[PDB]
Write an enzyme that holds these catalytic residues in place. Structure first.
Site, short mmCIF file in Angstrom:
data_model
loop_
_atom_site.label_atom_id
_atom_site.label_comp_id
_atom_site.label_asym_id
_atom_site.label_seq_id
_atom_site.Cartn_x
_atom_site.Cartn_y
_atom_site.Cartn_z
N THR A 64 31.26 48.63 37.16
CA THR A 64 31.81 49.44 36.04
C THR A 64 32.43 50.75 36.48
O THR A 64 31.88 51.45 37.33
CB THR A 64 30.66 49.66 35.03
OG1 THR A 64 30.28 48.35 34.59
CG2 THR A 64 31.07 50.44 33.75
C1 04C Z 1 30.58 47.33 36.83
C2 04C Z 1 31.64 46.24 36.55
C3 04C Z 1 29.88 46.86 38.14
O1 04C Z 1 28.47 46.70 37.93
C4 04C Z 1 29.61 47.52 35.58
O2 04C Z 1 28.39 48.18 35.98
C5 04C Z 1 29.20 46.24 34.77
C6 04C Z 1 28.80 46.71 33.34
C7 04C Z 1 28.72 45.62 32.21
C8 04C Z 1 27.86 45.79 31.12
C9 04C Z 1 27.85 44.86 30.06
C10 04C Z 1 28.61 43.69 30.16
C11 04C Z 1 29.47 43.50 31.26
C12 04C Z 1 29.55 44.48 32.26
N1 04C Z 1 28.02 45.58 35.35
C13 04C Z 1 28.09 44.36 35.96
O3 04C Z 1 29.16 43.85 36.29
C14 04C Z 1 26.77 43.70 36.35
C15 04C Z 1 26.32 44.26 37.73
C16 04C Z 1 24.83 44.58 37.89
C17 04C Z 1 23.91 43.57 38.23
C18 04C Z 1 22.56 43.91 38.49
C19 04C Z 1 22.12 45.23 38.32
O4 04C Z 1 20.78 45.55 38.59
C20 04C Z 1 19.74 44.83 37.88
C21 04C Z 1 23.02 46.22 37.91
C22 04C Z 1 24.38 45.90 37.72
N2 04C Z 1 26.93 42.25 36.54
C23 04C Z 1 26.00 41.34 36.13
O5 04C Z 1 24.95 41.65 35.56
C24 04C Z 1 26.26 39.87 36.43
C25 04C Z 1 26.85 39.18 35.16
N3 04C Z 1 25.05 39.16 36.86
C26 04C Z 1 24.38 39.43 38.01
O6 04C Z 1 24.61 40.40 38.73
C27 04C Z 1 23.21 38.53 38.39
N4 04C Z 1 22.08 39.33 38.95
C28 04C Z 1 21.11 39.84 37.94
C29 04C Z 1 20.16 40.86 38.62
O7 04C Z 1 19.51 40.25 39.77
C30 04C Z 1 20.43 39.73 40.76
C31 04C Z 1 21.42 38.70 40.13
#
Ligand code: 04C
Ligand code: 04C
Ligand code: 04C
Ligand code: 04C
Ligand code: CL
Ligand code: CL
Ligand code: CL
Ligand code: CL
Ligand code: CL
Ligand code: CL
Ligand code: CL
Ligand code: CL
Ligand code: CL
Ligand code: CL
Ligand code: CL
Ligand code: CL
Ligand code: K
Ligand code: K
Ligand code: K
Ligand code: K
Ligand code: K
Ligand code: K
Ligand code: K
Lengths: 201, 213, 219, 199, 216, 204, 196, 199, 196
Positions: free
Chosen positions: H1
């Site tokens: 994000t």
């Molecule tokens: C930017 C794009 C990069 O993180 C933003 O923070 C974005 C915000 C957001 C919020 C609501 C809906 C869509 C986007 N966050 C993500 O892209 C997010 C990254 C993230 C994962 C884990 C975290 O710590 C627990 C923090 C940030 N992406 C996801 O959640 C994706 C869909 N899924 C995964 O990462 C799967 N993970 C879950 C946690 O354990 C490891 C595998």
């Protein structure tokens, strides 16, 4: 600690050391390791001090209730079994307690060893603590069912004293009891090192 | 992670005589290589007959003293009398053990008089194993205080000394001396020494200055 | 340890306490921490005791040998570079935090050198466990071009602050003034704590100790 | 640290903050991170203090010999190459980025980044822990063909903005300007730092 | 809280004749990053006791609301009773130890200044329940930097005028700014007296960077 | 702890024109005691003694390797060793093993040959020298020994009184340590003579 | 886990060692000898790590023998014990250390009967009597109880008997046979092995 | 994000990038991180996608009920408070920062940060992984009393600069403007992104 | 580490258990009994964790007894074995599991002699013969070698003898005494304990 108890023709004798250790340091050297439950029940202590104190006092608390309820006093078998059950409620939680239960009920002279694990066995001889192996050696070499009160007092005294000489964590004094048909009588509270010099002629 | 304990130093000493009890401590509260305060005496009045000394983790010592205070009141409303020295010591054992699996990092020593007016001292470990004795030290400098008392009060390792009974005067200097020695070696001991004297008349406090480095 | 350094108008001044600890027990009450390097270059050592001892003695050994070969007044910048290249080679395993101060043909100089081999040149500094107390006093009261006596008092206050506030610090404050003329090593300049007096005699009449064996060897 | 270098026509500008840190404590609030490698080649220090300084010494050593052997002032390209080589040979053991900027007769004013043991020439370069907080600013506030004074302001502004945001950056701004005529070393003090949004 | 997010550094306390003075900088850090450089780490509990807090800011704002409501609740009764500085100190001690004993601590170090019954109050509260009283107080790096200064002055002069306490505090904030990497040059001064609590607006300590030219 | 494995107590004291050195007689492995007559004080010359507390091997090893270097010193040099020089010799010997040290903290007590002067010192396991005008202690019961010495020591003690003080200090500090004891041996060093004594210590 | 024991008298040394060669849960041998002949009047009893014991014991054995060939006379029990102590102590702070616990019994024409105890850490101690292995914990007290420095050989074998009977009764491990040998003025004499 | 909010006179502006990431992969290159909580209260999403969205739902749930019970559009202060409370109650279990911005009759246009469970009102606020790279820019490029169009450019510029630098930010810029009159949702596409220094 | 063994014949079951109560390195008891009487014709031999064995064994013992009182007849050796199997299996995926290895011998008036083997994992298997403990590794082959399903009691005691002699000779641990009992039509008969 070192702790010993054996039975012979004239009852059961019980001897313990008096040292309390915290790490490599001697915290107490006048520590009482025998609990006098009733006039004819006796408990020894080995392991974690606070564990021993509390739990054998809790046994004593219940041996009290049994006498007030049943009005007939508690058996040796019952007592040692009750303690084993208290130990079993706290399984794999790190309680460290090794105890021997002595007494006289209708079954005659009763000797029991109870573990923190829950282990409970009857026998003629037992020894607990860091210096049990030394106490065993001198006990076996000089034991017979045909001991006199004076011979047994000599053996139990000897067994603790010699154990305390080899064991880093045993010392202070020997505290000995004679369990007779009409209850225990406390024999002696003799200094360990004083005896070792006496035995050295 | 996160540690629920801190080490705050402090040594506490108690000695029993014919008609008196002594509870003494340093006034230093510390944390790491810093002193929190120079004005933290470890002695505490519970009754006119009994005084407590707590050392170790100050957070535990504070909460524990407040538990005892409340428990003292609970007893007196229920029993119509004061909790005796021996009773407080017995109660303290049980309180400390109820935390056997999450212990008070605490070293308690109880000083007062028994029901015959005689001096009584009770020494505890963090988990509640206790007994009565003539003299005992607890805390960071307890190993520094013990051997000198063993020799002088217990008459240990001596051949033809006549075994003189312990006087208040002599014990007072003894208490002062061992702390003066400990303050020179233990970094957690210093600032000031507070002595609480329990007698039939009551509790009298006395303060002697120590090394402030 | 608390150790500190200060630059004034006519030279430099170094400070140190006298406490050594083994575990958390005061081993030495009167150990020396201001070390001789050259007749007009001195070094304060903090950290691992034996380490600050050998590094400083090694540096002094190399500095006398350097002065002998050049026939010149040793340079403090030479001391600082020798020290840091030695310490960098050991990758911080020699626990010696040093405050080096002295006088050159290039005037009064003050350096600090950390165990890993990093250095900095500055008007004032403090090292050791009581460093926080000393810099506090220095940042508060330091001025450029102070008088020797104004500089000597502030330094005492800086070390005193360390002694009183730090549990790993005690004893006397040692001072060393270095001038373009000479160096005065004022050992035990100020001494805050005093308790030598008492009123408890613990003597034993010959024969209280029980003896089993006696042997006498004539000389 | 925050360190920075900018290229102009006549030469270069090199700036840094004046802080050294150990954990949360600052041990030196006035440290000059602009070390000369030769007479018209400087380098900006970041990372491990001991590791950085050690690289600075050996770089200055070899460039002195190299300079004498060629009987000519070392090329800025040459300077960058020697720092780059020490950084690469001990990339696991030495932990420091060094910006090398200077001026020579062959190629004028030049700015080189050597982080981790790579080598790249840039119109300007930032480095250190505080560089993260000014990536957006430098991209927006940069113009090609800035005057010496403009480059001087550009570095000052960017480092000021980084120091205020970064906990590992603080103190004063040390500036050097390297041209054909020589080196101009100036210091920007606390009262003299450019003001921005601070809330 | 297992891992604190936004933290505040050292809080200062020292009691003068006829009151107490508290200082804390207006910074909330996210690790090393200075995130919020204009937030208050001090509150007025009531008209007798005040509070500055180190550590996690969300935990401070939570404790700020709980204490805020307690004062409101008491003001509603209007029975001539109010919380003394000692009472607030005792509550806070009990709160921290309770949270600590449930292995879920409020990640804060606290300084409580107060004036009641002609006596000045200054109390320390830890996240583990460590509590005491002292004439001068400094948390975090202040305990290593500012606390030595305060003690050295209070040794030479136990009683200070309000002016003397103020200038001593400003002197301490100067040291903290120079030496703490997690500090900032925007701070507040809080004061308890007969008149009540007074929190003063954004202040800067005077800095000098002339030693930047003393390296040649 | 590594020093804790074998235990042991070594102590030195100063007096009027004399020095005293004392050690426990125990050799033991953690849980048990093996020997009652184990040696810890070794003579490095007539009127100069070294007491060694720590790991029994390194206690013996350092004593044998110091003797090696001492004998070569006394042969190459035309003289008997001064106390300061032995201290520095032990310091160099120990520090040579900076990053793989002998687990022993030595105590040196003696009178300077020629000059008469009493000298006592104790050292690190990596060779940091400590010189005092009163007493030095080393072992698993350092804290206990410190408590005694601080309370018991006086500035000008005659041989008769010095022996009693160093004894009582050793006896009672050892009785609080579970890894020290089985007898105490005391050496009193004078110009005219050396007096060696084994005490009636606790055998528990 | 093995057992060694030595009893030194006024003019003789009695030594005994168990005869088990154990691997995991099985007794591979009933008649294994843990004694090594170093001289006509020196025995070295070794115990510990499986591959390390014999290799180390024989290395010392071969060097004491080398000394005899090179000098026309044998090492004194003290010189031998101190040699083996040096060799173990030097391998301590090395990449490969020897985990061996040993007992040296010998007779010197001057000093007399000698019994030496040695750690795997290489700490050396002279003792009137000693035992190695877990059995020592059960037997050292028996030895402490009945030992006088003026014990006769007839009484010493009887004292060893008392100790070995304890290992049968109380010790968890099965050690039914022991090697028994006496060193004196005339040398090493093989004695009737004690079986149970 | 990368997420951002700015306050002006008539109301607020809320912007975000359009990327969702798992490790080094992007799983959605066009995601709107501007969730409505009420009719004139929006929130900007960052952190764990599942954790964020869950907070957004419960916040929108409670504000709907709260809005009906007061028979009035919820206060922006109230909105921020509910998001702040869920964030605090599960600070160890929910891992997301949410910027809450909007407009109400009582206090006009407002911007709130709720990271970790604290609550603060700011003239403007940035959040997300890409916020690190634009701290310097926003401090330098901010003016008080910006027009709606200026605020719109300010957020666009700052997010563009962050997305180019941050690997975890990408896609398009979603903008919403909240005033008394209503909500204006617009999208800034790849061809339409403001250009800066890119080398 | 303990030893249990069972041999089932055409009309009888022979069972044997060692009599050692061991703690660390010492034998606390020479005469400990590891057999539990469940019925007139059911024995349960238990082995494993020190506190867990007796507690578990007695719990099952008391419930088989409860069944007898509640119904006027005893459980069949199969029903008993399956009951004890259920109780162990249910504690397996729990916070406190019982590490007990057991052997159930019994005689049914209909099915006949029965021998059941049970894991600490609570897997149940019916066998003509089985053994528990490390000794099994050394004895199961002897049993495999000489076992015929038509073995007489005289020959079975002789086969047990052959197995127990192997434990003395090859097994590292000291197990000198064993309890020996036979179950049949008439019930449980205490037999001469085999000592070595
Ligand atoms: C930017 C794009 C990069 O993180 C933003 O923070 C974005 C915000 C957001 C919020 C609501 C809906 C869509 C986007 N966050 C993500 O892209 C997010 C990254 C993230 C994962 C884990 C975290 O710590 C627990 C923090 C940030 N992406 C996801 O959640 C994706 C869909 N899924 C995964 O990462 C799967 N993970 C879950 C946690 O354990 C490891 C595998
Ligand atoms: C001998 C001396 C060997 O320890 C005895 O077993 C003796 C038993 C005993 C029984 C009743 C009265 C007095 C003495 N044991 C101890 O002295 C005992 C040693 C021990 C420590 C910890 C253990 O748990 C793993 C087991 C045994 N010492 C104590 O119990 C001491 C007084 N207690 C503590 O050190 C308390 N700790 C526990 C956690 O908190 C910090 C301090
Ligand atoms: C102050 C007193 C510490 O707060 C100083 O740093 C002081 C430095 C000094 C002392 C004497 C002479 C010159 C300079 N340091 C010590 O007192 C130092 C304490 C220390 C112990 C362990 C350390 O971690 C590796 C670092 C410092 N004193 C010692 O080294 C003492 C004499 N010896 C030991 O504690 C044994 N060490 C040796 C090194 O390995 C760890 C154990
Ligand atoms: C800014 C101020 C923050 O670090 C700069 O990077 C600064 C640059 C610099 C370069 C030359 C001379 C002075 C200053 N760096 C430091 O201040 C540096 C930070 C650092 C420490 C450890 C590292 O890991 C290897 C990387 C960077 N500070 C120091 O080196 C100080 C003098 N000493 C220590 O922190 C000691 N360290 C050594 C490594 O292990 C942790 C303790
Ligand atoms: Cl009196
Ligand atoms: Cl050097
Ligand atoms: Cl760039
Ligand atoms: Cl605010
Ligand atoms: Cl905090
Ligand atoms: Cl509460
Ligand atoms: Cl207080
Ligand atoms: Cl050598
Ligand atoms: Cl997609
Ligand atoms: Cl989660
Ligand atoms: Cl049933
Ligand atoms: Cl499973
Ligand atoms: K109790
Ligand atoms: K816990
Ligand atoms: K204790
Ligand atoms: K500040
Ligand atoms: K040798
Ligand atoms: K990208
Ligand atoms: K499982």
């Amino acid at each position: 600690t070192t702790t010993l108890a054996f039975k012979f023709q004239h009852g059961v004798i019980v001897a313990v050391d008096s040292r309390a250790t915290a790490g490599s340091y001697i915290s107490s050297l006048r520590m009482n390791k025998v609990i006098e439950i009733n006039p004819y029940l006796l408990g020894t202590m080995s392991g974690c001090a606070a564990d021993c104190q509390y739990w054998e006092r809790l046994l004593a608390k219940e041996c009290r209730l049994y006498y007030l309820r049943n009005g007939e006093r508690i058996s040796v078998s019952a007592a040692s079994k009750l303690l084993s059950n208290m130990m079993l409620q706290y399984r794999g939680m790190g309680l460290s307690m090794g105890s021997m239960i002595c007494g006289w009920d209708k079954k005659g002279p009763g000797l029991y060893y109870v573990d923190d694990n829950g282990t409970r066995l009857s026998g003629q001889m037992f020894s607990t603590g860091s210096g049990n192996t030394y106490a065993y050696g001198v006990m076996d070499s000089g034991y017979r069912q045909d001991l006199s009160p004076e011979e047994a007092y000599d053996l139990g005294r000897r067994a603790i004293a010699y154990a305390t000489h080899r064991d880093n964590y045993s010392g202070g004094v020997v505290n000995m009891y004679h369990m007779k048909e009409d209850g225990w009588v406390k024999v002696e509270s003799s200094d360990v090192s004083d005896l070792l010099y006496k035995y050295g002629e | 992670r996160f540690s629920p304990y801190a080490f705050n130093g402090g040594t506490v000493l108690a000695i029993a005589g014919e008609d008196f009890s002594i509870v003494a401590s340093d006034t230093r509260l510390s944390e790491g290589f810093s002193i929190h305060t120079r004005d933290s005496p470890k002695c505490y009045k519970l009754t006119d007959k009994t005084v407590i000394g707590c050392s170790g983790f100050h957070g535990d010592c504070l909460t524990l003293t407040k538990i005892i205070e409340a428990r003292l009141k609970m007893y007196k409303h229920s029993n119509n009398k004061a909790m005796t020295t021996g009773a407080i010591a017995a109660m303290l054992s049980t309180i400390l053990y109820s935390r056997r699996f999450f212990p008070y990092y605490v070293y308690n020593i109880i000083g007062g008089l028994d029901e015959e007016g005689k001096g009584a001292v009770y020494s505890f470990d963090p988990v509640g194993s206790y007994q009565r004795d003539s003299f005992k030290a607890g805390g960071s400098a307890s190993a520094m205080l013990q051997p000198l008392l063993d020799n002088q009060v217990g008459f240990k390792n001596m051949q033809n000394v006549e075994h003189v009974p312990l006087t208040l005067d002599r014990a007072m200097r003894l208490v002062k001396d061992v702390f003066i020695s400990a303050a020179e070696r233990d970094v957690y001991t210093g600032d000031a020494l507070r002595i609480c004297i329990v007698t039939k008349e009551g509790i009298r406090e006395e303060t002697v200055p120590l090394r402030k480095d | 340890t608390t150790i500190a350094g200060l630059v004034f108008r006519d030279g430099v001044i170094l400070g140190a306490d006298t406490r050594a600890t083994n575990d958390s027990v005061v081993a030495d009450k009167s150990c020396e921490k201001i070390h001789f390097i050259a007749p007009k270059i001195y070094c304060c050592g903090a950290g691992v005791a034996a380490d600050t001892e050998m590094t400083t003695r090694m540096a002094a050994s190399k500095m006398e040998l350097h002065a002998l070969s050049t026939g010149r007044e040793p340079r403090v910048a030479t001391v600082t570079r020798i020290l840091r290249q030695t310490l960098f080679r050991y990758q911080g395993h020699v626990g010696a935090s040093l405050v080096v101060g002295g006088v050159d043909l290039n005037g009064p100089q003050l350096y600090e050198v950390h165990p890993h081999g990093s250095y900095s040149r500055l008007p004032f500094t403090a090292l050791g466990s009581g460093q926080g107390a000393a810099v506090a006093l220095l940042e508060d009261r330091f001025q450029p071009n102070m008088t020797l006596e104004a500089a000597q008092e502030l330094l005492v206050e800086a070390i005193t602050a360390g002694i009183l506030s730090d549990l790993g610090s005690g004893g006397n404050v040692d001072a060393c003034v270095i001038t373009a003329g000479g160096a005065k090593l004022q050992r035990a300049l100020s001494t805050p704590t005093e308790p030598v007096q008492r009123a408890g005699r613990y003597r034993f009449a010959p024969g209280t100790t029980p003896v089993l064996t006696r042997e006498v060897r004539p000389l | 640290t925050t360190i920075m270098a900018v290229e102009f026509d006549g030469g270069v500008v090199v700036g840094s903050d004046s802080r050294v840190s150990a954990g949360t404590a600052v041990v030196n609030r006035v440290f000059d991170k602009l070390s000369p490698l030769h007479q018209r080649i400087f380098c900006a220090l970041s990372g491990s203090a001991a590791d950085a300084q050690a690289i600075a010494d050996m770089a200055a050593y070899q460039l002195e010999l190299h300079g004498l052997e060629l009987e000519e002032p070392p090329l800025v390209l040459a300077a960058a190459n020697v720092v780059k080589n020490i950084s690469y040979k001990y990339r696991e053991d030495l932990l420091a980025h060094l910006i090398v900027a200077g001026w020579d007769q062959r190629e004028g004013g030049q700015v080189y980044g050597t982080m981790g043991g790579m080598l790249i020439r840039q119109p300007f370069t930032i480095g250190g822990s505080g560089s993260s907080y000014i990536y957006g600013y430098v991209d927006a506030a940069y113009k090609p063909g800035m005057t010496p004074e403009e480059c001087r302001r550009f570095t000052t502004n960017a480092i000021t903005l980084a120091m205020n945001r970064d906990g590992s950056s603080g103190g004063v701004i040390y500036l050097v300007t390297i041209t054909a005529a020589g080196v101009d070393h100036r210091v920007i003090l606390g009262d003299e730092l450019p003001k921005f949004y601070d809330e | 809280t297992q891992n604190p997010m936004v933290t505040g550094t050292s809080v200062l306390g020292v009691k003068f004749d006829g009151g107490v003075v508290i200082a804390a900088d207006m910074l909330g850090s996210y690790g090393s990053l200075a995130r919020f450089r204009n937030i208050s780490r001090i509150m007025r509990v009531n008209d007798s006791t005040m509070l500055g807090a180190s550590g996690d800011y969300a935990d401070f704002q939570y404790l700020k609301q709980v204490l805020g409501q307690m004062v409101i609740d008491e003001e509603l009764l209007g029975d001539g009773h109010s919380y003394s500085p000692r009472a607030i100190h005792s509550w806070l001690t009990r709160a921290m130890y309770s949270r600590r004993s449930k292995m879920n601590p409020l990640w804060n170090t606290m300084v409580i200044g107060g004036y009641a019954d002609g006596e000045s109050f200054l109390g320390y509260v830890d996240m583990l329940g460590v509590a005491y009283e002292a004439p001068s107080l400094a948390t975090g790096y202040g305990a290593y930097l500012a606390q030595p200064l305060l003690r050295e002055v209070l040794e030479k002069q136990p009683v200070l005028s309000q002016t003397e306490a103020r200038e001593l505090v400003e002197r301490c904030m100067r040291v903290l700014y120079y030496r703490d990497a997690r500090s900032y040059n925007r701070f507040q001064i809080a004061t308890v007296t007969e008149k009540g609590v007074e929190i003063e607006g954004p202040l800067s300590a005077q800095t000098n960077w002339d030693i930047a030219h003393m390296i040649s | 702890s590594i020093m804790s494995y074998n235990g042991g107590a070594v102590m030195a004291m100063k007096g009027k024109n004399c020095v005293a050195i004392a050690a426990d007689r125990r050799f033991g492995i953690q849980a048990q005691m093996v020997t009652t007559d184990f040696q810890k004080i070794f003579p490095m010359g007539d009127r100069l003694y070294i007491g060694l507390a720590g790991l029994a091997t390194d206690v013996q090893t350092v004593a044998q390797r110091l003797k090696f270097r001492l004998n070569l010193y006394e042969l190459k040099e035309g003289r008997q060793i001064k106390p300061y020089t032995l201290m520095s010799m032990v310091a160099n010997l120990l520090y040579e093993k900076r990053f793989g040290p002998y687990y022993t903290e030595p105590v040196i007590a003696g009178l300077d040959p020629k000059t008469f002067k009493p000298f006592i010192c104790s050292l690190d396991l990596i060779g940091c020298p400590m010189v005092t005008d009163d007493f030095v202690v080393s072992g698993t019961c350092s804290e206990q020994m410190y408590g005694m010495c601080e309370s018991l020591w006086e500035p000008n003690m005659d041989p008769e009184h010095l022996f009693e003080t160093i004894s009582q200090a050793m006896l009672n500090a050892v009785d609080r340590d579970a890894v020290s004891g089985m007898g105490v041996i005391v050496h009193v060093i004078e110009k005219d003579k050396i007096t060696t004594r084994t005490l009636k210590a606790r055998m528990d | 886990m093995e057992y060694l024991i030595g009893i030194q008298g006024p003019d003789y040394v009695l030594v005994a060692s168990d005869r088990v060669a154990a691997s995991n849960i099985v007794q591979m041998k009933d008649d294994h000898d843990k004694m090594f002949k170093m001289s006509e009047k020196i025995l070295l009893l070794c115990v510990g790590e499986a591959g390390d014991t014999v290799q180390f014991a024989e290395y010392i054995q071969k060097n004491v023998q080398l000394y005899k060939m090179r000098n026309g006379y044998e090492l004194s029990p003290t010189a031998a014990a101190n040699f083996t102590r040096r060799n173990l102590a030097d391998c301590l702070r090395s990449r490969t250390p020897y985990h061996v616990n040993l007992l040296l019994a010998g007779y010197d024409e001057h000093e007399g009967p000698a019994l030496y105890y040695m750690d795997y850490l290489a700490a050396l101690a002279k003792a009137p009597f000693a035992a190695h292995g877990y059995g020592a914990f059960l037997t050292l007290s028996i030895l402490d109880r009945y030992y006088t420095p003026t014990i006769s050989r007839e009484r010493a074998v009887e004292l060893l008997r008392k100790c070995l009977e304890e290992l049968q009764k109380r010790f968890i491990l099965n050690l039914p046979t022991f090697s028994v040998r006496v060193i004196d003025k005339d040398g090493i004499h093989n004695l009737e092995n004690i079986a149970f």
